[PDB]
Amino acid sequence: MVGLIWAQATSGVIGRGGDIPWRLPEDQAHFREITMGHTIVMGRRVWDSLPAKVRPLPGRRNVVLSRQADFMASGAEVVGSLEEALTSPETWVIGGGQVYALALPYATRCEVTEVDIGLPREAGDALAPVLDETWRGETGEWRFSRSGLRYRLYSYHRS
Numbered sequence: 094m095v096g097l098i099w100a101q102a103t104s105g106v107i108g109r110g111g112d113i114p115w116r117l118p119e120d121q122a123h124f125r126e127i128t129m130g131h132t133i134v135m136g137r138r139v140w141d142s143l144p145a146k147v148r149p150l151p152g153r154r155n156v157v158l159s160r161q162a163d164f165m166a167s168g169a170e171v172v173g174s175l176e177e178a179l180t181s182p183e184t185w186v187i188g189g190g191q192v193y194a195l196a197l198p199y200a201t202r203c204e205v206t207e208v209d210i211g212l213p214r215e216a217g218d219a220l221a222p223v224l225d226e227t228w229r230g231e232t233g234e235w236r237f238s239r240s241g242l243r244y245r246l247y248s249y250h251r252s
């Protein structure tokens with residue numbers, strides 16, 4: 094089982110300038126619930142985007158994909174290919190744009206948070222993968238964040 098988990102603006106943007114272009118701390122508990130106790134896989138840039146105090150993400154085996162055969166990530170497993178990354182029975186891919194696109198064909202679950210923020214795509218942004226008709230989904234109810242942003246959860250699956 095490979096699952097993907099991300100948060101996106103309605104437009105599809107998930108990343109800009111090396112970070113996430115909104116604040117949504119309400120997202121954190123759901124991300125932990127899905128991922129805790131499991132192997133998580135991320136691209137090298139996503140690892141770089143984690144603050145030092147939070148990386149590796151605790152309670153999860155952190156696996157970092159990089160083409161640098163020598164790359165350095167304390168508390169994480171650096172691998173050079175997605176096949177090497179994917180060895181655990183249940184794996185959650187936690188980004189970024191490159192790695193979601195790489196892992197999508199392997200995935201049978203996505204847990205998506207949609208952020209109701211007006212954020213037109215710009216060139217060079219990180220973007221969420223598009224889910225086609227092979228996926229079936231349930232849409233959750235909108236909630237307001239302490240930031241003022243509405244957000245909602247989708248759970249998608251395909252067998």
Ligand SMILES: NC(=O)C1=CN([C@@H]2O[C@H](COP(=O)(O)OP(=O)(O)OC[C@H]3O[C@@H](n4cnc5c(N)ncnc54)[C@H](OP(=O)(O)O)[C@@H]3O)[C@@H](O)[C@H]2O)C=C[C@H]1C(=O)c1ccncc1
Pocket residue numbers: 098099100101106107108109110111112113120124135136137138139140142158159160161164172173174175187188189190191192193195219
């Ligand atoms: N909104 C989001 O949900 C996310 C945004 N981000 C954002 O995406 C952006 C990073 O995505 P990118 O597409 O630029 O990069 P990555 O996919 O993380 O890494 C690409 C790197 O992986 C590596 N890579 C890519 N393809 C391969 C490959 N085929 N083989 C080996 N390595 C590969 C390469 O590494 P090296 O340069 O060290 O060689 C490549 O440069 C940042 O803005 C980041 O803040 C990342 C994860 C999530 C995320 O943090 C997250 C997930 C769930 N809930 C809340 C947040």
